[PDB]
Design an enzyme around this catalytic site. Sequence first.
Site, mmCIF file in Angstrom:
data_model
loop_
_atom_site.group_PDB
_atom_site.id
_atom_site.type_symbol
_atom_site.label_atom_id
_atom_site.label_comp_id
_atom_site.label_asym_id
_atom_site.label_seq_id
_atom_site.Cartn_x
_atom_site.Cartn_y
_atom_site.Cartn_z
ATOM 1 N N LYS E 156 10.581 -2.841 4.174
ATOM 2 C CA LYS E 156 11.236 -3.028 5.465
ATOM 3 C C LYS E 156 12.707 -3.351 5.274
ATOM 4 C CE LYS E 156 7.913 -4.387 6.716
ATOM 5 N NZ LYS E 156 6.633 -4.580 7.490
ATOM 6 N N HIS E 275 -3.438 5.358 6.494
ATOM 7 C CA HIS E 275 -2.969 4.365 7.430
ATOM 8 C C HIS E 275 -3.601 4.739 8.763
ATOM 9 C CE1 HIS E 275 -0.244 2.096 10.025
ATOM 10 N NE2 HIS E 275 0.180 1.454 8.952
#
Lengths: 123, 123, 439, 140, 439, 439
Positions: E156, E275
């Site tokens: 991130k 995912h």
Amino acid sequence: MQVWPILNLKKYETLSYLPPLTTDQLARQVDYLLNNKWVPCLEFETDHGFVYREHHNSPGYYDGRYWTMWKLPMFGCTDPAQVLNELEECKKEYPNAFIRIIGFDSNREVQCISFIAYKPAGY
Amino acid sequence: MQVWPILNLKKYETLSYLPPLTTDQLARQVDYLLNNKWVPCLEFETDHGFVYREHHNSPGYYDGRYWTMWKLPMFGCTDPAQVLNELEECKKEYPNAFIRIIGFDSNREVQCISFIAYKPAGY
Amino acid sequence: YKLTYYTPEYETLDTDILAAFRVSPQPGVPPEEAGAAVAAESSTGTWTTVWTDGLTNLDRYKGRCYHIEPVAGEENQYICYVAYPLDLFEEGSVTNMFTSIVGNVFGFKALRALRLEDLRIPVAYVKTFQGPPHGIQVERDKLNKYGRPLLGCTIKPKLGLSAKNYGRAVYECLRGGLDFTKDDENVNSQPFMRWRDRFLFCAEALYKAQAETGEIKGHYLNATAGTCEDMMKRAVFARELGVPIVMHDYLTGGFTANTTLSHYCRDNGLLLHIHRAMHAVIDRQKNHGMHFRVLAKALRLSGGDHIHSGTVVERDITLGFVDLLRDDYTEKDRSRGIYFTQSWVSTPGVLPVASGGIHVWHMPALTEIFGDDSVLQFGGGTLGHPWGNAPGAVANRVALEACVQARNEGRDLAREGNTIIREATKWSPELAAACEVWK
Amino acid sequence: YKLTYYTPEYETLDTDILAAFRVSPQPGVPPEEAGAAVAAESSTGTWTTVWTDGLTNLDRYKGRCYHIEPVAGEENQYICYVAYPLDLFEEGSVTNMFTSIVGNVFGFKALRALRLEDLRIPVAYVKTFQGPPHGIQVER
Amino acid sequence: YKLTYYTPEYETLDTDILAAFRVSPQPGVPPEEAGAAVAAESSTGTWTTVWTDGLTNLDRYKGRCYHIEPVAGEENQYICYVAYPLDLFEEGSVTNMFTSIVGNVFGFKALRALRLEDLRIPVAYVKTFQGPPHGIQVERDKLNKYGRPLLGCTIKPKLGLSAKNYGRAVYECLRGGLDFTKDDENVNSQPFMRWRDRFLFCAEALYKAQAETGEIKGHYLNATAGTCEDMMKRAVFARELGVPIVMHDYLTGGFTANTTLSHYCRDNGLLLHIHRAMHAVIDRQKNHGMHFRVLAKALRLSGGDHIHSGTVVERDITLGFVDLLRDDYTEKDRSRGIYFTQSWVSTPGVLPVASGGIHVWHMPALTEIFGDDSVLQFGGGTLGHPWGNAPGAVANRVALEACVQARNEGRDLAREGNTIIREATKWSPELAAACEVWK
Amino acid sequence: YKLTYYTPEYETLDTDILAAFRVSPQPGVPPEEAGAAVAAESSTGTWTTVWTDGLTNLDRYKGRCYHIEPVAGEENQYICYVAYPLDLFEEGSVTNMFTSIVGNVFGFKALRALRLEDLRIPVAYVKTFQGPPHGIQVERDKLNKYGRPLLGCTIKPKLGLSAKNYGRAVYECLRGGLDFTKDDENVNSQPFMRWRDRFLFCAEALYKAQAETGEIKGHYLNATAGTCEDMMKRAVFARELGVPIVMHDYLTGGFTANTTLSHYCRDNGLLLHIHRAMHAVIDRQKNHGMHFRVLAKALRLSGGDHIHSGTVVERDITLGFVDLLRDDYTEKDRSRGIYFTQSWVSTPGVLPVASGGIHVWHMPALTEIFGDDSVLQFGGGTLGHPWGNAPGAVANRVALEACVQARNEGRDLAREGNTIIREATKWSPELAAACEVWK
Ligand SMILES: [Mg+2]
Ligand SMILES: [Mg+2]
Ligand SMILES: [Mg+2]
């Protein structure tokens, strides 16, 4: 129960798992070639004497298979003493080389023998 | 604020980030395997004990994953002292080797354990 | 039939495909009629007359029973020799050769049983095939291995191990001195070990062993599959890994797929190991089927570098077909089950593979019976050694080399074999250990 | 073998590949041993013990002679029923199915002759194959 | 319907696909009619009679509500069990399985809401799928990682960093001791970071970290794309780089594309991380949708090696579907939301991935709840460490190993977790530093 | 969050992707915080601070809740408007658009439920997509059909008929006057009817009907499959047959596969019919999920020529998204559930398909509500006619044409529909027959 060593245990194909050959055993192996009408020849290698892959990677390609010819095959050789004399000669000029005895069967037209005759310093 | 070292910080997977295991901690890890009915076995490596890629480069292929088996898996082993005794034995024959303890779960039929038990000279 | 197909005056042509059939007629059927039936039934021969036969010259396409001889010690059994014209066969197709000769006759009512014993493949037909991708001499040059039998070790259990554990066993075997490891014939691609994972872990293991020993190593990667496509995908990945040898179950995969694989192996430098799974379904009984020597000739034509050939330790029958697989020319020899003189016009020989329940004590016998040009496969003979695979491999490699040295020195392996082994145990703890578990 | 491979108490699974073999043993070989030989020889079964067997659970991969019945009117001939676990086979490969079941047994010394009479192909294995390109109704 | 579709006497076949639906009927609709409606509406069932029905035997193709049970503590809600014949489904197509069962019923007027809770996939249908490209055991063997959960770190911010800066973060994370780094589900190919540049810089970073630590590393390269072609181009470049793992958002990319990628991963040796973005749109509400366990079974069939599965730290519901993803056989267990006994006939298990707001103090709980076979993903739990990524990675790796050691020694992670962590801070400055920022 | 993500002063950019979310917070969570949570959770927003955020300018990548309004008549529910910068999205990827906006938020703890109601797709992003392979006007020109709704007939039973019997039903339907026949969404490739046999028999039937009537006909051949490869093989055979239209279940097949098929259809001239199987799993409940209008916009971007859109006979909500599928520009209209003004910059419109339990008596209502640009699908409404499919087709075609004529003459379909139908029964025995079975 003993563990098979891992370090410095490189081999050289036929007869390399037996204790090193004495002059007499060498002489008998060379007589086997003569008695079969195979031509003796010596090969030596100063660099690494094992197979490796540097120049190519496709199936069946390996570097290190060819060593270098000591003089020429001994055509018409009748005495093992001739071969062992060259071994001595080669060993003197190349005390640092791996020297093997090979033989050619001109009838099947192929190399048919290959055994380690001398290995240098603690090999 | 401390910087994580860059030099000579190679690791060996599970448990390698903890301080080296004492004989007693070693003994407890080995008892975990026994209590689970997993078979202990020792592996050692004298050359480089980390993963590398020499012979191929496709996904999932790495060299250096297999090390060499110290004797055979210890089937029917009931005492950790048996394992640690072999560790001692292996260490004596290979003071220069990386030695790890691995275990097999013959029920899931896979290797299920692998931890560094001994590392040589300042590693 | 009798009239058209039994032709005892016939002189076979050098282009004819000749067949020797062991015929057991139904009682009441004389030999000449049976032989004539075998020839008709495997060629032209129709139950009723058809006008289209007059459109050609059927004498040029018929099979001809040209000779019949009684079988000794058997009741109502003969060897009938049939000649088939060259024109009946598709060039380079073992599949068609077998269909034409063996596709119909075996079910004939008048016959109680039937067994094809041998075939004389004419040199003109032999030249239409590729033969072995490499053959004996080229394989020895590629692997740089001379003057002794090659050594292999079959990995067991065949099913149950994960791909990595399987590879671990491969490394321990090869590092000990064996030249090859092998996938069992059953090992293709299954739930607990998919082919690609196996190929990959076996590749890591064999390169590790080769780097350790300095000697060239190989693992027979089984490419046998359900379709030509799947089989080719497996061979292609082997090429990608740069490994030396792949394997195929030629009888269960079949001749069409085998020939495809053989051609691919030639074009990509891969050695090809052939396993004969299912052969015993066909070649076992003396009265009906096809003798293994016929299946062995077929494989030499379609192509393969190694071929499983039993273990001996009927010696003579076996040595007979070993010559048929290895040599360029083999003369007729009934004592060895060789019904026809066979020439190969330089098609490379195939390395016979001896396997099955063998261990160190059979070493002098195997070397003596097969000679240098053979591959000796040891499964339990290695994986059963008390100190593990590497020592099991060393014990086998040492015993073999002790035998080769002794033979070369002029010792008689037949009479001194046990002594040559005993002598080596005095200096090889690994061999001494094996000898204690075995004889 | 007798011990490991002759399992008369065995209840076959609906996923098992079942085989009915017509067994003619060599004289001196009782049926139960022959049936046990047929099952071992066509599955695991090794002439000598190997350390790698302890790496897995071989009971899950073995063939099991679960039943034997005499052949009527024949001398020394039985029908032995063997069960093979689903996991032994490659999906959609008749080639592998035949290799696994018929690739090795027929040459066994203890057997005088051997004939595979039938196979029960489990529905789970049947679903891995395409089957006929078209079949009867579509062809009509 | 009532008559044709409610069949309480029905004995399900082992080949039947069974479904457990949580049915909330409109007031005035009795359970038996609703269950009969659910079965008809998801199979045959037409609002008016059609002459073509007489051309077949519709009893062989109909869905059958064979059982109904009230839901406890709910008003007007039942669990209806429906059986669908094997013949209704296309082999190996999760896409068709979902269309047939869930494509039409949910909109039925007579139903106020509807939720698919579970499906019993019969073994005959399970065998038509490839399943995971590799699965748990093969993945551990390939990565040579045993006896502990795997550790990952999500990079991130998801958007904003350039490809190189993104790669820098990847290297700092991996060198600290984590096994994997990961692309956020949103990270595909965008203006400030095109996919190829990302793949390339991530490759340099991961190889640098692997060479530094000696441990195998990986980065989940996101291959999710707008078309099958674009998705395949991304996976192909990953193969080219020689890296171990790619990633796919199976719900947003969809089942057809996922299956394609799964097959490609099997054929090229790539691990596949899945995912579950968008799952909460479907599985959140108890009254309408599909429970995650159904989507988890679907993924195990289509194929994936890892699957995001929440974070726990309804424990029991979660552990229930964790068993369904990992094990070969799971028995019916209502207390765990397992409505049917499920067999997988050796289809490889999938590694559950725990993620979301986790840090060092959850380590003993995660290890205890998931055990060794899991992947623990730490985004802010690593990138938020005060000394940076490498120390953040070391703190996590150390805390995990301290927990594994303690557990193996027989300590109770449930009761001693905080103490095991505190004990490690005395010798790990990195962990001590993390603990100060967190609990 | 509150601070960073709730930005009521924000002026949206014409390049921003705007989202209207129906937010139901947990009690104790004020609207502004929830809206701020929705925006953060669907964009940047991390549970802990990370040093890498300082490497970029995160204000340029964050989602911004710029407006919040209470929902009338609901307790604790608001519409929060979020703006997402153009730079967050991959060009032409509906898959990425959905992952970014809907991939994570729905599971947020602070939210009790969440439903995406609408999205304003900016024209700059719209231009990165292909959109419909053909669209309304091009489809009418290709089929040479003007001034009336198109008519289709879904073949039933969905499972059970053999390929030929299925084709027979297709011919009887088309020859009666309907424009299209259709494969049920469940019909892909199954044991009793493999796809290729179906395609082939349907091709013979449709060409026979076209040659008989002189009117262009089509059958929606279902190409939905388990993998991209299988799906492409089906579309390719359709191209080979020279037929006009293929079909895809875009939600179960997924967006990546749909886009691939859409591009192939554009490049090969195939019309593409889209079925929305599974939509009700997502769009049904008012409190959680995604409204159908959002899934409808997605399909218009990825691509499709027809899209199933319900049956009406909430009228207004439906007409609202019908305009969104067909028109170039639709102004904001809350009364119709249109939260944002939407421009399409000439992307072709999609033909809405009405289906489900409809028959002749709904004809005046369907024509009036949908107008000419629609496809009316009749399954049991045709196959249930007492005289068979052809007469069932004629009854529908006649009723439709009677309605179009009447409308064109200025009659009010709303008030005179039943009379227009009754009037036609006096001269159409087929329609008279249908009317007797229905009203
Ligand atoms: Mg074998
Ligand atoms: Mg994420
Ligand atoms: Mg339908």
